[PDB]
């Protein structure tokens, strides 16, 4: 099915953010089995491998934003490979790597199917913009690079000549906010994006939340979904092993509930698997809890149902 | 008072599946003040004692199915013992012991019973057939035996003779399911049983899924429940010594809200408290958690109400 | 802004429960730095300093009732603070200290403004009247002092005379119960007091718990609100560092959504922040994790939110 056709592409980029080991977040999904796993669960597992990031020598930064060309460059690769990758009639899996990459994931993906709707799963907004960032960290400003009523508010930064915004505000749903900058909280109320902040999900629930988020963006016709997954959208209880974790978190059920409610639609054509850093885990068990969490996460897009699954045979003869 | 009559029945046997332990159950929950508690909770309680499974050398296995001999003759006694506590006009409670023990006591609850309803708790479906089964350990197998649709589906298993299936499959509902094998989930769907996996639990809140489980047994007609309630039903982080623990279960408030309701119907009749395994803690800590959780499940089972209780007196002359 | 114009009170006293470490409460939460998190929030913050408890020689026991002189004077002193507060236009900020001292913070608070409305958001009732007590703590006891109904059941306690109930059993809601004592039921269900103990918030979700919290008080006409929260209400795997605590509390998600939703009525007038110990914890990290829990609540209270807070200024220019 078309729903369980894949094609991985590996991103070992880490410059998007400070902290060394998310780089090493592919090799390590790699380790726990990802592609074994999904051959087991019906998925025609097609592996297009780790791009390769040339190392940039002299990338002095733009202003506060660091590493500019490194994160341009790395994305710009990225969203040729998903756009090769989902003209092969493949769902792009992109193993992360800092949330920068982002750019290159949603944009490869726009080139072959542009009326694609967003599913941004994450603590953050990801919308600071070269100007309105206060760290001058790229993996928080992805949003803000790829909205088209953010025209203008973007300068020539070096190393995204390439980029073009190819969504616009109303194909986008935020769940799991709960660490907002004050720019970033203006540009999500001026914009009217639509949003489900830890507040909504604890007033609503999850299953209402999947069911407004779902008829927002597939109401009017079917399109394609593209979910960009942050894992610091869950509680550090589930993934500590990550660089920016905020307390108060999705919890492992809620996650598997979204997932699950995603491959319910049949509409998945683009995922993201990002922020996963080895380096960063307290204990080798709180490394191997993010892992587990990030693979199971991952098996549920693809048809993995807690209530069970079999295949089309009768069982009883 | 109907509710608060009890019959302990203590069912040491552990070869219904691979790990030692699990007949220490009825040990380490008596040693915990159960009895007790369950005395300080206005109860009238008597204590069976513990059953002697006298040992059945000379057991080899049925095709890939382990001990059934040994597994076979613990139930029919277990079943003999509850149906003479059920005649006496007290609620059965089975302190186990691994989970085949429920082929006994529900067949003996029903003998005396025949309209009970099942609402069984726990991760897994318990529903394997000695055919579709892998792992050949009967505890994962209760369901098929005493579902009345499976008749046919059931060979010629030595110790298993006495066995005439008294439960139809509009008769039972699973509460806690996440861990499901392709035969399982197949004859889960076939058959229509009624079912809340985790999934449901996360789409409804477990307001809604008690509210549905009491309305579906008791709907057409007030008839008595048998709640077999399995450990690992309940998220290890509250339950861990347990032979097949499963991430993302039921919480300790969810735990005590089904219980606590299904206390209110009135209509309790039978209760199992299986698969403790005080030998499969990774520290001491972690056996008392799990035997103190356990014994609260018990509690509320028996009238603990989280919002207090108090005696017909006037408290404040 | 007025739910943004706050008026500091610290009150350093142990005396209404028998565990030393209480009274250190106010140091603690003054160390993580309140005061400077609430004016970087937009907050109009006046320090009142923390109040001086004389220490009482021959405070010879009332019954069972340990210390009667010395809580009812730091009461007394409390209750002319908040007034004194409340006069001044600032919402009362009491930073306890145990929950006896709430006799003092909704007298003074009610002084002012008798319409008030109390929110008591605690794992207990502490409605023990002094004869109905078994502890002889007082802060198990302050809900009875307080209530008019119970006028007449309460007796000549020595520090006491001066106390004037003022709230109605009507006038009150209750939110996180699930330790509740039988004489403090037995009231509860005679004086038709509206609660949410955890078996409503499973059943109901905090949601429609905060929408009929809210609604009961607020019907008829705007009034002014008074939240009592014991961090004891949350549970004891967010907030360990407290003298009674119970499993299955309300969760770190659930505090800040009640905060959040009484913020946005604008209506707070008085808080209580109590039952913090800083010599509770297992280790230094349940003491800074219980501290940081009990400081995200207070500012939830005055106006932090998880989808986000932005100054009144354009952050694109
Ligand atoms: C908790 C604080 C100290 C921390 N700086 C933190 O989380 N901050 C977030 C929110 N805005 C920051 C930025 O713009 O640099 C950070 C972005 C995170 C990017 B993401 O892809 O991991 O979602
Ligand atoms: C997760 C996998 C590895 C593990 N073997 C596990 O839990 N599997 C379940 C599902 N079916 C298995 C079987 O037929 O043996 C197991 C039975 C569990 C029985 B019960 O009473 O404890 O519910
Ligand atoms: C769990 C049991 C053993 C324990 N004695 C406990 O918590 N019990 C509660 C209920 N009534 C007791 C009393 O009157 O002393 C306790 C009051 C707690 C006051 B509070 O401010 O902290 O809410
Ligand atoms: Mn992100
Ligand atoms: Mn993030
Ligand atoms: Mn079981
Ligand atoms: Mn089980
Ligand atoms: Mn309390
Ligand atoms: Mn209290």
Redesign the interface.
Known sequence: AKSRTIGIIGAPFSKGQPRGGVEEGPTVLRKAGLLEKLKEQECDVKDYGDLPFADIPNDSPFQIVKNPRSVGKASEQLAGKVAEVKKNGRISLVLGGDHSLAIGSISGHARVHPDLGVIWVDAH?DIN?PL?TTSGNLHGQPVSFLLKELKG?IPDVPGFSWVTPCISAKDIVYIG??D?????????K?LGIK?F???????????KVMEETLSYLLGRKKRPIHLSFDVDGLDPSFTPATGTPV??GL????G??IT?EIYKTGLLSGLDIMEVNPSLGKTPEEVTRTVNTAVAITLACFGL???????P????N
Not at 180 to 188: A, F, K, N, Q, S
Not at 251 to 254: A, L, P, V
Not at 305 to 311: L, V
């Open positions: 907004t913009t309105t508010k906010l709960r907002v900058d004050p720019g970033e909280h203006y540009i999500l001026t949003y902040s830890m507040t909504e999900v604890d007033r609503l629930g999850i299953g307390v108060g919890t492992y059920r809620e598997l509930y699950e149902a807690r209530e069970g699954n079999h295949k045979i009768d069982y009883l």
